[PDB]
């Protein structure tokens, strides 16, 4: 087995980790365990710290800022007498190879923390990846008040990720009935998806059934896969952006039924102009898929992403009320979009 390592600009400090991606199982998260190699030759400040930081990065010309959401600090050197932690198997392997000079560090990620999400940049952006990202920074100083010198430190980007649940949810199904006043005639819309859990790049099948017992006519049927992003930092923000769509000219005449299966597949190639779109966290600048739906058990910081399919019937009423009163009929179907658990 191999492990990751990164050194400070002048080499005096070297971090070691076992993996970059840490899985959030909701009930627990994979711990961030590692070691920091320090030589006595370059050990003058005589205090080495390690910090885990969950930060929201945001932007005029490529300038960015990091607001901390969760920060945790561990004093690797010296080992204070009032804190003795047992080493992980990964850590004890690392000391066995490196020696005493390697000082361990172990962070526990609490639940209800945001996952690593990167907001899509435009072609005219040169700054670092904006969004929510985790980061492990090891440095040495005389005390925590001292200003850390960029060369006496090292930072490594890590990600907090989730994977598809083992048990699939119930089949997403939804109904709605629009009843008009001119006559006692209902316009019924029923829609359903093939399954509850979908993987990225996989097709979504929307079964649509319309029972039009009214005098009006359905001119167009609009299907769309829409990404819901809830961003809770200061106050509140949120938006819906359609990662897939189809505008069928299928018509439902009065006093007639209609039934058709629409198949949509959300992918990034046709969404590269939608700046701010939620994507799965980027290590540095790697191309990543549409952000996976984050699952929360029972107002949580960071970017919370979900997905819904909207089926809208465009109706032309006319008659008594003319075109003043809208007669459109829509329904929505929530679903999960994330990657399978790597075996």
């Amino acid at each position: 087995t191999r492990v990751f390592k990164k050194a400070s600009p002048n080499g005096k400090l070297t971090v070691y980790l076992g993996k970059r991606d840490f899985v959030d199982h909701i009930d627990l998260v994979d711990p961030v365990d590692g070691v920091v190699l320090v030589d006595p030759e370059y050990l003058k400040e005589r205090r080495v710290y390690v910090t885990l930081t969950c930060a929201f990065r945001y932007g005029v010309l490529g300038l960015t800022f990091r607001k901390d959401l969760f920060v945790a600090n561990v004093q690797s050197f010296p080992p204070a007498p009032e804190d003795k932690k047992p080493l992980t198997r990964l850590q004890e392997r690392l000391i066995k190879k490196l020696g005493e000079h390697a000082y361990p560090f172990t962070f526990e990620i609490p639940p209800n923390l945001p996952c690593s999400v990167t907001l899509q940049p435009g072609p005219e952006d040169t700054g670092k990846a904006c969004g929510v990202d985790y980061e492990v920074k090891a440095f040495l100083a005389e005390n925590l008040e001292e200003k850390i010198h960029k060369r006496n430190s090292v930072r490594l980007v890590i990600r907090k990720v989730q994977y598809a649940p083992e048990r699939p949810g119930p089949q997403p199904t939804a109904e709605t009935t629009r009843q008009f006043l001119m006559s006692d005639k209902p316009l019924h819309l029923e829609a359903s998806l093939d399954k509850e859990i979908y993987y990225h790049g996989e097709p979504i099948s929307v079964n649509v059934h319309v029972t039009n017992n009214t005098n009006k006519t359905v001119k167009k049927i609009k299907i769309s896969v829409r990404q819901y992003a809830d961003i809770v930092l200061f106050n509140t923000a949120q938006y819906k952006v359609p990662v897939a769509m189809e505008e069928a000219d299928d018509t439902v005449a009065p006093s007639s039924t209609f039934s058709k299966v629409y198949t949509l597949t959300p992918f990034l190639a046709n969404n590269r102009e939608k700046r701010g779109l939620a994507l799965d966290g980027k290590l540095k600048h790697e191309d990543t898929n549409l952000a996976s739906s984050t699952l929360l058990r029972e107002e949580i910081l960071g970017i919370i992403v979900s997905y819904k399919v909207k089926v809208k019937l465009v109706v032309s009423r006319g008659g008594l009320l003319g075109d003043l009163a809208s007669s459109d009929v829509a329904v929505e179907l929530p679903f999960t979009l994330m990657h399978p658990k790597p075996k």
Partner: antibody
Amino acid sequence: VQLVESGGGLVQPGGSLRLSCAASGFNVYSSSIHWVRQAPGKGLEWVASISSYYGYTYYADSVKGRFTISADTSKNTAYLQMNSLRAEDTAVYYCARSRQFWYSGLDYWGQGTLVTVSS
Amino acid sequence: SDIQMTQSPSSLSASVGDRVTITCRASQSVSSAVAWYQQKPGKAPKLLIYSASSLYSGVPSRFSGSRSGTDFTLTISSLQPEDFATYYCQQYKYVPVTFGQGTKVEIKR
């Protein structure tokens, strides 16, 4: 699941030939359609790749500026359009499958039609 | 100006039930991004191991993989009638991806 190749045949040097492979059991966006070039007793040589989910094309340096890789996402087919064929490009071209998220190697191949280039 | 693979075995020959090993040294470190393949004559290749040591599904238990820096290996616990084909070493960290020359694994008579 199956991959089917067609469009292989003899073409004079400097000519043009086109190849396509059917896809069954694989979604175009959930996979990437690689291509390979193994002449008899010469070994595998990757010629081109297409990523439908990220809309990227990749070409071998020798291939660059000559073959074009495309994909009709509806019919689930990938079309390698070969232009300005050299006599050296005579080989059995296979069409491979890869996991779009994330790369797992070439886990499935088609039988591969025979391509010949000579005067 | 591209990474090249160096399968050390050229024409391995062994009897049934033997433990055979095949090693390919990457020109420069390609990390654990290494795959092994099996190709019968007149047939298309099959995938055996991915990520250097992660056995693929639909492959026997006998197959397994390891890494020694630039040297990546392919080991079969017991050799079988089915397992008598030319094998290959691949790298997919840097594009273009490249393969090995091929090893002529054959029966002993």
